[PDB]
Amino acid sequence: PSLRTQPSLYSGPFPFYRRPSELGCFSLDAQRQYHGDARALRYYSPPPINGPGPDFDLRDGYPDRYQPRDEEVQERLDHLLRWVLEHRNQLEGGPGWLAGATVTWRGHLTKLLTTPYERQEGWQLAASRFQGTLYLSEVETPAARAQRLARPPLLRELMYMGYKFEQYMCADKPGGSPDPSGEVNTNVAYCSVLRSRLGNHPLLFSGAVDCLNPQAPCTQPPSCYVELKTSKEMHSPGQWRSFYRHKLLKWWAQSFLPGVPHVVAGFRNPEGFVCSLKTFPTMEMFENVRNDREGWNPSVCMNFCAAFLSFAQSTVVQDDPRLVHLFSWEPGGPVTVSVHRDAPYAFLPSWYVETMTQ
């Protein structure tokens, strides 16, 4: 019982992917407390044209104005499940749509999308079927956990700089001035809840959103959202080519699924300053590698994701929230399955299961 991941197996036409619609949202505050509203959403506020160029110190405030989320707490699907519980009757699709859907985090689907091209980091996905619905929840691999606990200082500062970039580009109110004098607190998050469909697989997923563009042409979410990214400055065509082949694939897969149309990138120099910005429309990212022998192909990404969802659906036969089918993958191998029950892999909490049962 295994699933192959080589790109040439998935090189056919681009599958059907239904335009995502936003069903709702939720926020996590500076204490990581859930709120069923948009209080955490920030507003895109880039450097005023006809003014000084970007000149952002991404090291400013590290580490004495840094409040990092405690990554030892494994929340799994818990926050999305709370949202689903509070909106289960109000769900679209009519009677039984949820029973035919797959529920997960946007980032879990992103990892599936990139799997045919991924050569460094493996993953594990726990799957449980409950009342027809297939739930997918990532499990930290042993290697990932050891790498997290032993994170070098350079990597921890690099991670801070990406969060700090958002503080220079976003404001708490529309049209407001960004305020970098405050704290970077990575417990704070605004999450969009979206519905889509990949082939014949209905999807319900949530993803954290960086900011909202109030000046965006369309007011209908998710089309007004903006993704913010940093990357090292590049100086040669070879460096840009490596960026197109490896980094843009990850950016595309993250923003394509929720229908975020623009990624705004700040390019940081060796001293940690962002002195240039570039906008990458999600739907044009593949153009950079369309004629590249070493490029990626969104059809392969999407066809593999569809194949995995079919593979997962047919593998997970039992409707049991205590039962976990664990899907494991390492680069160059197939996705393999093992079966487990209860702790530690079981991830649907009793408060969700009991409420849905009653």
Ligand X SMILES: Nc1ncnc2c1ncn2[C@@H]1O[C@H](COP(=O)(O)O)[C@@H](OP(=O)(O)O)[C@H]1O
Residues of this chain that bind ligand X (CB under 6 A)? 159, 162-163, 165, 210, 229-230
Can residue 118 be called a binding residue for Mg ion (CB under 5 A)?
A: no
Q: Which partner in Mg ion, ligand X, none is near 230 (CB below 5 to 8 A by kind)?
A: ligand X
Would you say 162 or 199 has its CB closer to ligand X?
A: 162
Q: Which C-beta is closer to Mg ion: that of 202 or that of 207?
A: 207
Q: Distance of CA 316 to CAs 36, 132, 136, 323, 338, Å?
A: 31, 10, 11, 9, 11
Q: Give least dist CB 234 to Mg ion, A.
A: 19
Q: Closest Cα partner for 162 from 277, 55, 267, 271?
A: 267
**Measured from the CB atom, is 301 or 307 closer to ligand X?**
301
Tokens representing 347 are 């991830």
Q: How far is the CB of 243 from ligand X (least distance, A)?
A: 13
User: For Mg ion, how many residues bind (rule: CB under 5 A)?
Assistant: 3
Q: How far is the CB of 13 from ligand X (least distance, A)?
A: 29
- Is there binding between residue 230 and Mg ion (CB under 5 A)? no
User: Shortest Cβ distance from residue 223 to ligand X (Å)?
Assistant: 18
CA atoms of 202 and 100, how far apart (whole Å): 7
Under a CB-based contact definition with an 8 Å cutoff, are residues 260 and 276 in contact?
no
| DSSP result, 51-112 | SPPP-EETTTTTTTTEE---TTS--TTHHHHHHHHHHSTT-SSSTTTGGG-EEEEHHHHHHH
User: Of these, 210, 259, 260, 352, which contacts Mg ion (CB under 5 A)?
Assistant: 210
Q: Which stretch binds Mg ion (CB under 5 A): 30-38, 204-212, 231-239, 291-299?
A: 204-212
81 with 205: CB under 8 angstroms? no
Strand-strand pairing, 17-28 and 189-198: antiparallel
Specify the amino acid at residue 226. Answer: V
Least distance in Å: CB of 222 to ligand X? 14
Contacting range for Mg ion; rule: CB under 5 A; set: 153-161, 202-210, 230-238, 298-306: 202-210
CA distance 304 to 10: 6
109, 212, 228, 302: which one contacts Mg ion (CB under 5 A)? 228
Which of Mg ion, ligand X, none binds 163 (CB below 5-8 Å, type-dependent)? ligand X
Residue 110 binding: pick among Mg ion, ligand X, none (C-beta 5-8 Å cut-off by kind): none
Rounded least distance, CB 220 to ligand X, Å? 22
Please list, in sequence order, all residues whose beta carbon lies within 8 angstroms of the beta carbon of residue 239, skipping any fewer than 6 positions away.
none
Q: Which residues share a beta bridge with 17?
A: 198
For Mg ion, give the closer residue by CB, 158 or 208: 208
Of 209, 208, 204, nearest in space to 224 by CA = 209
296 binds, among Mg ion, ligand X, none (CB under 5 to 8 A by kind): none
Token pair listed for 309: 């969802």
Q: Which is closer to ligand X, CB of 105 or CB of 130? A: 105
Looking at beta carbons only, is 130 or 267 nearer to ligand X? 267
Q: Judged by CB under 5 A, does residue 25 bind Mg ion?
A: no
Q: Which is nearer to Mg ion, 228 or 305 (CB)?
A: 228
Question: Does residue number 260 form part of the binding site for Mg ion (CB under 5 A)?
Answer: no
- Nearest alpha-carbon partner for 133 in 76, 72, 85: 85
Q: What is the C-alpha separation between 289 and 252, in angstroms, rounded? A: 12
Binding region for Mg ion (CB under 5 A): 208, 210, 228
